[PDB]
Nucleic acid binder design. Structure first.
Ligand SMILES: C[C@@H]1C[C@@H]([C@H](O)CC2CC(=O)NC(=O)C2)C(=O)[C@@H](C)C1
Lengths: 167, 185, 53, 148, 51, 122
RNA sequence: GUGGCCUAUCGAUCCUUUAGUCCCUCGGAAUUUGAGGCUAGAGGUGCCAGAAAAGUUACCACAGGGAUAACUGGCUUGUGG
RNA sequence: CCCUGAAAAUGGAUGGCGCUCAAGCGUGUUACCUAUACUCUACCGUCAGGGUUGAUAUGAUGCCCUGACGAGUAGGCAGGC
RNA sequence: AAAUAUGUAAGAAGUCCUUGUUACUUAAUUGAACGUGGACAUUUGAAUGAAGAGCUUUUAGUGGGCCAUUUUUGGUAAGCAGAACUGGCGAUGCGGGAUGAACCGAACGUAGAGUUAAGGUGCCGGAAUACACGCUCAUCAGACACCACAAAAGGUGUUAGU
RNA sequence: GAAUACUGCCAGCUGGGACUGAGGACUGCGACGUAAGUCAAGGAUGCUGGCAUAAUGGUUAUAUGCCGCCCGUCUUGAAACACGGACCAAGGAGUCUAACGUCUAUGCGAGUGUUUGGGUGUAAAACCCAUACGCGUAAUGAAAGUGAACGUAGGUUGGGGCCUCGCAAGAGGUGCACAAUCGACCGAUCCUGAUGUCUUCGGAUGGAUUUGAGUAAGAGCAUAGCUGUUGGGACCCGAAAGA
């Protein structure tokens, strides 16, 4: 033998975990974050876009739709920590939004082989977008310059201090 | 920083095991470790500690000493316990019937005890018969009768034996030992 | 003091058990009322320096 | 064996355990018993009082065989009888058939009296005997026969 | 396995000291004191105002 | 003990603690000396097991014996392991610690301000 | 009253000598000389816990020492300026 | 407080740059910076105190629980390569 | 005749009652010493602490020291020589005094977070070109303890005061 | 008649930030609950995304910020304008022995040690053994000599363990080792000096501020080991000399 043997062998049985005392209580959003508030998107492919907050989802995400008619942002989820809640608000008591949940935004069952190693929007998404944002457009047109504001992108200017800004 | 009031990392200074490699002594230590943990009898703890001692700390116990111990009032029927060797003594001519538990019996001591109608038994037999040391009597031999102890604490006026090879006249009985030759101690 | 301790114990056996035989250090003082009646406070001040010669 | 010595542990340490200041030297205080009266006086007087000087008379041509006289005490006296017959002698202590113990053949010159033999008569044959040893033998009922 | 601070972690704070719930229910940390209209003596006032 | 305090004055800051200070100190940093070991109190049963023979059945009983210096103060205080405080959270308030509190330093009797110091240190 | 009113006024081993015990030993017996022992003093070591001890080296040697002198430097500044 | 008293040898030292309602001197009040120190946590080792054998564990100088400690020449001891 | 420093005591190996031993002692059945019996938990005779207490054997290195505050001797003095107590360096890194054995702070397993010590916060350089009241202008300003020096003596410079 | 400052208290509420997630069935203390149960209550879980490889990470070179004087040595103090060291390889210094101390392990144990020698052998091995001898079991004295129980091998104080009673402290009894103490015994020293008698021998009995490396129900012998000691070349290298 090149090595004698371990006289002691460690046990091969994996211990079970102890009971964890951590229940999952619901998130407590900020006070400024209420449905209908215009949000500034701080990250993603829609950085700086003005969107309307619509619904708090069960995965803690926020359902936004800055209508295509204004800025091209579709119905999608965002994280509450990556938006700025402004002071301008539109009425959201005329839109139906309970049908939108995590299953509505389920993406794909990615496997170990179905990958784009080298290099189509659904019709229900298109129609749900039109139905949700027609009433948003009707609310948006009810105040001057709201459509233009929501179409424009946010960006910091020179000598613009965000710790002293009011949104 | 901490203002230490005592030496740090100080070992207790007591044997926690026999230094010997005797497997049978180690089995006895295993038995009395279990007994001293699982019983509240101080006898088992005493025996466990006695099983750690060195040869000079387990002096032999003579059968005369055993008989003198059994002479004490109410001690006639007690089991004598010697954690060490029991040796024979020809100075004494009569023995009572008694039970002696010991690590070792000399051939003469074993013969004399058995001839007196008694029985010699090992410490595990003692553990089986008396698990809490019921009705026992622990005997210990004389420690300071060792010849090395004669020389401990040698010094002027201390009255100890000098470390010396040859003995007699001409060997350290002169100046320093009598007033006619300088001084006495 | 040994004789006094024995006598205190002997009396405490009759009445007043726990007769507090041990001595104690001087305790901090208890509360008290200090009366100004006939004892109006006199105000003192530091004194100026003088040469004395 | 060399592998258990401190020499192996001192490998790598400069002074080999002898100190940097003291510097283990050849014979810093002399050889043997040098200076026993001068610079080793305190050691010699504390641990070996009596060392210096002479006491007593000389003895030219001393033969230790003249002084051969091993001592045997009464408490060990009965060990000279073999075990197979000691018991029959201790029982039936008779003035008419008493054991003869020849201590000289046993290799002893004088019988001392540390005493407490059993009350059994014995004929003790010896070159020399102490007063108390003879008294205890006779009180036990035996006799001491002197031999050369 | 972990020392949990009372004065926070109300659960340990109430495991020790069961009276803490009564304290916080009766608001014993904000006990309104009675009104007394005792006036210091004039001699006290002049002594304080002296010099 | 006052002569001891005089004798160690340049090395300590001391004063008269308030009930709030004692309660927070024993709730936050209270440890028992059980069998020569530093044991976090963390439960009333520990105090009952080691101090119940003096009638102290809880951490509030222990605090009461501290605040009103009771008949068994010596045993309760000795049961308490010496408190290991941190450095004060807003600092010492002085440029140099090793002058008397009276002379603008930190050591000595600062009697009632010991509460503020200990709260910052706790 | 167990020397000097108190605090200083003094000395091992070996050797010699004296007193004491009339004692022990001279070993094949014995006696008498002689010698050696045991107890207690003295004869002395002042480098005073105690070797028996003259110089010189500019012909020199060795082990070492910056534990230590003979320059500079450093501290100091009496003296000097 | 400032100035005179106030002279040494390579060019030179509030540490340097520089500083004048100071970035100087005296004094007060705060905020702030950062040690291998203090507090809390993890991990290593050491020491101490403990638990663990009537079908339950490599069958015990093993496993495990709890607390506290840790600077080091000369040197001592121990476990290892 | 201090201050500081220093001896002892603060009990069970104790206290009390009674009566036992002796060849000592007493005029004495007086004592002395040691005892037999009997009575003494809220505190068994002040505080605080106690890290286990007590005991033994054996052996290493060392037996050049030096520095600081305070006391102190010789010397004009010395980074001189010699003592006292304590703390240090030697044997010790770390933050600060630019630098430095000894000063200040703090003593050290490997890391993370927080807070500080001494020292600092114009820039070098982490941190207020903070706030407040005054003083000073130097044709050698001054700028932090140990510490890297300054005096006697002078100025209708300027500022407070008797 | 009020406010407010300052100081202090709350087992008042609440927002932002950072570091940490040790453990691994259950057991505990609690809280909310009418209960079932739930919980922030003896240490992190839940949900989601990208990548699945040099992407993270390791190693290495370099750059940057800050720090970092050359080791060994003697020394109070070394980076020193103190000494040794240009570089590399190989060699290079506490050993063995005789006799010992303490400690430890082992065998046997009032004994212990076979190995001088003899017997035997598978032949420097292993195995077996008589008589002696060494140490120990007796000390003390210069020596001639003498030579260790008044007693339950003593009394007293303490003493682990054990025994008896005891819900439980505790109280009694016995108490080995060990410690202190007062005694007893053996030898030396000094003293006392009976019966008896080769009339100078013998030395009973009793005593003591004396003395011993003693007795008082043995502890030793042998082997081995670390450390320490002495003699030896003696940790290694080194004189000027002497014969
Ligand atoms: C001066 C004279 C002699 C002196 C002594 O014997 C000298 C030496 C002689 C010797 O070789 N070795 C020693 O031990 C001592 C002594 O006793 C004095 C009283 C009398």
């Amino acid at each position: 033998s090149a090595q004698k043997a371990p006289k002691w062998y460690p046990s091969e049985d994996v211990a079970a975990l102890k009971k964890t005392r951590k229940a999952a209580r619901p998130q407590k959003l900020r006070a400024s974050l209420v449905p209908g508030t215009v949000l500034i998107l701080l990250a993603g492919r829609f950085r700086g876009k003005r969107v309307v907050y619509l619904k708090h989802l069960e995965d803690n995400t926020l359902l936004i739709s800055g209508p295509f008619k204004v800025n091209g942002v579709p119905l999608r989820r965002v994280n509450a920590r990556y938006v700025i809640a402004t002071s301008t608000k539109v009425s959201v008591e005329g839109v139906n939004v309970e049908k939108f949940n995590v299953e509505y935004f389920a993406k794909e069952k990615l496997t170990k082989k179905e990958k784009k190693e080298a290099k189509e929007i659904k019709a229900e998404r298109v129609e749900d977008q039109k139905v949700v944002d027609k009433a948003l457009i009707a609310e948006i047109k009810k105040t001057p310059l709201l459509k233009q504001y929501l179409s424009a992108s946010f960006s910091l200017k020179n000598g613009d201090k965000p710790h002293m800004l009011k949104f | 920083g901490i203002d230490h009031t005592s030496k740090q990392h100080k070992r207790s200074g007591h044997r926690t095991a026999p230094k010997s490699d005797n497997v049978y002594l180690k089995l006895l230590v295993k038995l009395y470790t279990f007994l001293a943990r699982r019983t509240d009898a101080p006898f088992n703890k005493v025996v466990l500690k006695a099983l750690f001692l060195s040869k000079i700390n387990r002096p032999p116990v003579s059968v005369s000493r055993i008989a003198r111990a059994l002479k004490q009032e109410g001690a006639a029927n007690k089991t004598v316990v010697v954690v060490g060797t029991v040796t024979d003594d020809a100075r004494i001519f009569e023995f009572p019937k008694t039970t002696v538990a010991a690590l070792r019996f000399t051939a003469g001591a074993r013969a004399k005890i058995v001839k007196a109608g008694g029985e010699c038994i090992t410490l595990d037999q003692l553990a089986v018969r008396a698990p809490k040391g019921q009705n026992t009597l622990i005997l210990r031999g004389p420690r300071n009768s060792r010849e090395a102890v004669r020389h401990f604490g040698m010094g002027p006026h201390k009255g100890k034996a000098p470390r010396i090879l040859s003995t007699g006249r001409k060997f350290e009985r002169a100046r320093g030992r009598r007033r006619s030759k300088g001084f006495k101690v | 003091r040994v004789k006094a301790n024995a006598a205190k114990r002997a009396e405490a056996k009759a009445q007043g058990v726990a007769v507090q035989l041990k001595r104690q250090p001087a305790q901090p003082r208890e509360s008290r009322i200090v009366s100004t009646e006939g004892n109006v406070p006199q105000t003192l001040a530091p004194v100026p320096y003088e040469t004395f010669i | 064996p060399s592998r258990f010595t401190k020499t192996r542990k001192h490998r790598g340490h400069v002074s080999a355990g002898k100190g940097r200041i003291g510097k283990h030297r050849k014979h810093p205080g002399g050889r043997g018993m040098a200076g026993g009266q001068h610079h080793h006086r305190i050691n010699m007087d504390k641990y070996h009082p009596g060392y210096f000087g002479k006491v007593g008379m000389r003895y030219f041509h001393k033969q230790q065989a003249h002084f051969w006289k091993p001592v045997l005490n009464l408490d060990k006296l009965w060990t000279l009888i073999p075990e197979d017959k000691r018991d029959q002698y201790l029982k039936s202590a008779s003035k008419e058939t008493a054991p003869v113990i020849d201590t000289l053949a046993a290799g002893y010159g004088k019988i001392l009296g540390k005493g407490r033999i059993p009350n059994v008569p014995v004929i003790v044959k010896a070159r020399f005997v102490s007063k108390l040893a003879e008294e205890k033998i006779r009180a036990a009922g035996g006799v001491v026969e002197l031999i050369a | 396995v972990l020392k949990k601070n009372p004065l926070k972690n109300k659960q340990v704070l109430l495991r020790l000291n069961p009276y803490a719930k009564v304290f916080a229910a009766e608001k014993l940390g904000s006990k309104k004191a009675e009104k007394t209209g005792t006036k210091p003596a004039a001699v006290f006032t002049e002594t304080l105002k002296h010099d | 003990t006052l002569e001891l305090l005089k004798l160690i004055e340049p090395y300590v800051a001391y004063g008269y603690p308030s009930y709030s200070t004692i309660r927070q100190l024993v709730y936050k940093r209270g440890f028992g000396k059980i069998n020569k070991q530093r044991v976090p109190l963390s439960d009333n049963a520990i105090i009952e097991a080691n101090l119940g023979k003096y009638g102290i059945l809880s951490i509030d009983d222990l605090i009461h014996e501290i605040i009103t210096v009771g008949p068994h103060f010596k045993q309760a205080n000795n049961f308490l392991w010496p408190f290991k405080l941190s450095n004060p959270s807003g600092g010492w308030g002085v440029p140099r610690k090793f002058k008397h509190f009276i002379q603008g330093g930190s050591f000595g009797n600062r009697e009632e301000f010991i509460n503020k110091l200990v709260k910052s240190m706790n």
